[PDB]
Amino acid sequence: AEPGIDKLFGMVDSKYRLTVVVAKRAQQLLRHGFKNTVLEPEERPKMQTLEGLFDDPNAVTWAMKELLTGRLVFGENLVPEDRLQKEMERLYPVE
């Protein structure tokens, strides 16, 4: 199957909540550049024909790595929605 799904289902009260977390993390992990990541020092997803997944093949897979460590926080009403978007763009360039 997919790496450590059992661990991801356990992370969430709702099966479907995992999906939304993964998706919404994937979206920002594409939108505000790709440097949004929490895990990019050493061994993070890779590909073939070179080794080249360190920039931008599969954002959703990335999110599943990232969520597989305690680095990310997920929850109902964490931060006001609007300063969420203002602070993300403001902190990271690539536009």
Partner 1 sequence: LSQFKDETNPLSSLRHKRRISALGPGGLTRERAGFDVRDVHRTHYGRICPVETPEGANIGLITSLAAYARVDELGFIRTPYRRVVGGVVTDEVVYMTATEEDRYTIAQANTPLEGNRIAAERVVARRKGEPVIVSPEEVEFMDVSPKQVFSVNTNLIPFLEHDDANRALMGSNMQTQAVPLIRAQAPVVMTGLEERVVRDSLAALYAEEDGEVAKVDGNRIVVRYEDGRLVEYPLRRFYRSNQGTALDQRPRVVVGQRVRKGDLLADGPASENGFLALGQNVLVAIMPFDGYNFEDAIVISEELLKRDFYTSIHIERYEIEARDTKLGPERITRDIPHLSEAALRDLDEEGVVRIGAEVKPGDILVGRTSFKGESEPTPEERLLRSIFGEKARDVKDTSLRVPPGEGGIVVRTVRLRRGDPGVELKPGVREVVRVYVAQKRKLQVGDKLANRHGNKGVVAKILPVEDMPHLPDGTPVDVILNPLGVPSRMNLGQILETHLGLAGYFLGQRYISPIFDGAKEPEIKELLAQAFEVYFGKRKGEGFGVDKREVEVLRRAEKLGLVTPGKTPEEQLKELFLQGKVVLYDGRTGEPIEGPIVVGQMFIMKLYHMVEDKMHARSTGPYSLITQQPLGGKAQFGGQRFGEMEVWALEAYGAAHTLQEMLTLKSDDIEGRNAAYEAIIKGEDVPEPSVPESFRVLVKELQALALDVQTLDEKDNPVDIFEG
Partner 2 sequence: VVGPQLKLHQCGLPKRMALELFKPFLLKKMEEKGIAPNVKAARRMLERQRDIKDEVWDALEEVIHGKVVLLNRAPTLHRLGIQAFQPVLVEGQSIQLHPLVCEAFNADFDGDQMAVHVPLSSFAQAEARIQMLSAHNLLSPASGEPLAKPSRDIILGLYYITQVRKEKKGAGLEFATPEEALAAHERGEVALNAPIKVAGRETSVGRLKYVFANPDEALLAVAHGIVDLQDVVTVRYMGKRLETSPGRILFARIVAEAVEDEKVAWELIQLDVPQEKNSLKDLVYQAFLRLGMEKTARLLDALKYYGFTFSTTSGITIGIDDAVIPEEKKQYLEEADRKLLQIEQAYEMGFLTDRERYDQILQLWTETTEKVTQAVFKNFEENYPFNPLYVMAQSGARGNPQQIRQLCGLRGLMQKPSGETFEVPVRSSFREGLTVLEYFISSHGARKGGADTALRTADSGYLTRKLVDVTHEIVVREADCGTTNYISVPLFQPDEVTRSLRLRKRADIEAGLYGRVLAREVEVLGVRLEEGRYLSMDDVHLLIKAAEAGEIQEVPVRSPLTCQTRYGVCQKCYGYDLSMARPVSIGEAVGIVAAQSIGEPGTQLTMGLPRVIELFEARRPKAKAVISEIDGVVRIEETEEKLSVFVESEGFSKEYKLPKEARLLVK
Partner 3 sequence: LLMGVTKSALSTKSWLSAASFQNTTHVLTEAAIAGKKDELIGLKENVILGRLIPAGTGSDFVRFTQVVDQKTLKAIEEARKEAVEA
Binding site residues, partner 1, CB under 8 A: 15-16, 19, 23, 26-27, 30-31
Of 30 and 38, nearer to partner 1 (C-beta) is: 30
Of 15 and 51, which CB lies nearer to partner 1 in the complex structure? 15
Stretch that binds partner 2, among 18-26, 36-44, 73-81, 83-91 (CB under 8 A): 18-26
Interatomic CA distance for residues 31 and 89, integer angstroms: 9
Residue 73 binds partner 3, judged by CB under 8 A: yes
CB 71 within 8 A of CB 39: yes
Q: Is 14 exposed, middle or buried (0-12, 13-18, 19+ CB in 10 A)?
A: exposed
Identify the three-state secondary structure at position 90: helix
DSSP symbol at 29: H
Told to check if 10 binds partner 3 by CB under 8 A, we report: no
Binding site for partner 3 (CB under 8 A): 14, 16-17, 19-21, 23-25, 28, 36-38, 71-79, 81, 83-84, 87-88, 91
